[PDB]
């Protein structure tokens, strides 16, 4: 019933930044977390007298249920890369050296030789299926010199991903802490919203 954004795990849905839902795969996301904010209503919407219109994420528009170049998870919402592959929005935000082509639409994603050289270089300490602990790219805990490594989506599941507020003026506002260094209150509500996101999509 409650709508949760699968990128930031926030639950606020206002008229300016609405949490929307893909009508084929079911994922739910803030307009602003996916680059579809402030866009005009579709041409198909003139046919309806209803207040809502169908919407489809980019993977479904292309008829794929892709895998991510940067992690082993199959859930969540994706953006296409310049090479025709796919990455999670969340992985693109948190992995260093990965940037969005234009910030307004968050499209496309350009992955470099430097990104690919990090493949498998660290073992993800949170993978539940060790067969994948060395796929993709890990980030590390951002507390001091802590060298704890994990996939962005594995860290998301444990409620470890944080975003600084805009007023804080931190050039890279996306950061993560391992469980040893995390804010316990923040982990709690993020884990709670993650578990509700899993029950709603299924």
């Amino acid at each position: 019933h409650i709508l949760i954004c699968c990128v930031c795990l926030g639950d606020n849905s206002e008229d300016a930044d609405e949490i929307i839902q893909c009508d084929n795969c079911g994922v739910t996301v803030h307009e602003g977390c996916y680059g579809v904010d402030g866009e005009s209503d579709s041409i198909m919407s003139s046919a309806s007298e209803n207040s809502t219109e169908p919407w489809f994420c980019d993977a479904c528009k292309n008829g794929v249920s892709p895998s991510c170049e940067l992690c082993p998870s199959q859930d969540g919402i994706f953006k296409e890369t310049d090479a025709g592959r796919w990455v999670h929005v969340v992985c693109a935000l948190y992995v260093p050296g990965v940037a969005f082509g234009d910030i307004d639409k968050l499209r496309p994603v350009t992955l470099t030789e430097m990104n690919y050289s990090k493949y498998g270089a660290k073992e993800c300490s949170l993978c539940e299926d060790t067969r994948f602990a060395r796929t993709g790219v890990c980030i590390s805990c951002d507390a001091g010199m802590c060298r704890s490594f994990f996939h962005v989506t594995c860290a998301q599941r444990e409620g470890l991903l944080s975003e600084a507020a805009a007023e804080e003026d931190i050039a890279d506002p996306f950061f993560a802490y391992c469980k040893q260094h995390a804010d316990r209150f923040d982990r709690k509500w993020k884990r709670k919203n993650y578990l509700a996101l899993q029950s709603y999509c299924k």
């Binding site: 008229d15 839902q21 209503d41 207040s51 919407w55």
Partner: peptide, 9 residues
């Protein structure tokens, strides 16, 4: 789905 902006205040 996505609420049309005509239906947003």
């Amino acid at each position: 789905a996505r609420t049309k902006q005509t239906a947003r205040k």
